[PDB]
């Protein structure tokens, strides 16, 4: 849910003095028009607009700046520059009364993983594995990038995964819950959206790590393969029941890794449900394999985002002769920087095929 505790009208042309996202504070006049509401979450209202100069479509996220909570959203986005993270072009502030709104001017991205998946669920079809591979691979790259800074998104879900269906590019967004997790400082338990919360979070752990994002991504992967969320339920208990009904009852050791405060409860022993019986019979084995290595009870047992990219499920993307169903060519997949590969540099042998040099 929530986080931790503590314009000139000149078409109808709006002109503001907004500060750019990258570099030092050097604000400039920005004019835009054709403003209309396009999306909303639980916190921010998102507008679309056209920049008067370039004519480029943008998205303007307008969030109320409450001083009762910790708003790292602007602070975090400004330090991020990755091809699988939505770019922050400019930001500015605007004003019932005595209220300050933060405005984030972002690149406009037309679709989300959620909306696309909803299409296939309505049509009683499954998203082609190529797109599953593509979307998930770009997601893990974004996670690898922000984790290298120690930043944890803490709200990985399909509604937060913007898509450009033409170019098949995924961009992570919504850093309203993100935080740089410091080993030693506690965090808020009730974080992340339902269906995608890590088991340790559900148990109320306050000493979790960035591996919660990996769990969420496993939930997304599973959802893409299934056509529905794998761990639904309104309450934490409901969701945990669903998890156990698939992964089997967590061992005392696994419980200790999540939250030591539950090690002495006698939980009924439920036999785990085989992953191959979970998904459709046409489901690729490596997808199933990847899921099981993401959806682990023990946080440290889960793959790292970089390791996940190196998984053999994404081997098709490393093929030099792979293309998009619409005919276009694959997006940027192998332009890894030293920062992205910081957690495990030798993975570059796998991540970067010889035909990408």
């Amino acid at each position: 849910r929530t986080t931790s505790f503590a314009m000139k009208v000149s078409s109808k042309v709006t002109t503001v003095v907004a500060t750019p996202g990258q570099g030092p504070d050097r604000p400039q006049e920005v004019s835009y028009t054709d403003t209309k509401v396009i999306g909303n979450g639980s916190f921010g209202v998102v507008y679309q607009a056209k920049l008067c100069d370039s004519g480029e479509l943008v998205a303007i996220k307008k969030v109320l700046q409450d001083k009762r909570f910790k708003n790292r959203e602007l602070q975090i986005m400004r330090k991020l520059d990755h091809c699988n993270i939505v770019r922050l072009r400019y930001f500015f502030y605007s004003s019932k009364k005595d209220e300050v709104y933060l405005n984030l001017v972002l690149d406009y991205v037309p679709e989300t993983v959620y909306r696309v998946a909803r299409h296939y669920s309505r049509a009683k079809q499954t998203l082609p594995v190529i797109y599953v591979k593509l979307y998930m691979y770009q997601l893990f790259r974004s996670l690898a990038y922000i984790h290298s800074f120690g930043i944890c998104h803490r709200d990985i879900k399909p509604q937060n995964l913007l898509l450009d269906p033409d170019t098949a590019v995924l961009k992570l967004c919504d850093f309203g819950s993100a935080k740089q997790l410091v080993r030693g400082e506690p965090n808020v338990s009730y974080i992340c959206s339902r269906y995608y919360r890590a088991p340790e979070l559900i148990f109320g752990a306050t000493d979790y790590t960035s591996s919660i994002d990996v769990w969420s991504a496993g939930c997304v992967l599973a959802e893409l393969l299934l056509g529905q969320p794998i761990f639904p339920g309104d309450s934490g208990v409901d969701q945990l029941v669903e998890i156990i009904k698939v992964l089997g009852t967590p061992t005392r050791e696994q419980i200790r890794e999540m939250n030591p405060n539950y090690t002495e409860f006698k939980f009924p022993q439920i036999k785990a449900h085989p992953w191959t019986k979970v998904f459709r019979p046409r489901t690729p084995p490596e997808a199933i394999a990847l899921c099981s290595r993401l959806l682990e009870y023990t946080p440290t047992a889960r793959l790292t985002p970089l390791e996940a990219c190196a998984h053999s499920f994404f081997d098709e993307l490393r093929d030099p002769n792979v293309k998009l169903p619409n005919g276009r060519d694959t997006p940027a997949l192998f332009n890894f920087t030293t920062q992205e590969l910081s957690s495990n540099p030798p993975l570059a042998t796998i991540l970067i095929p010889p035909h990408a040099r």
């Binding site: 148990f203 109320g204 208990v237 029941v241 009852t249 539950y262 009924p268 439920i270």
Partner: peptide, 19 residues
């Protein structure tokens, strides 16, 4: 929530889906 109350609810639920 309290670990005691949470565990009770989960145990009650796990007993129903098992038997």
């Amino acid at each position: 929530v309290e670990p005691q109350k949470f565990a009770e609810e989960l145990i009650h639920r796990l007993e129903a889906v098992q038997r």
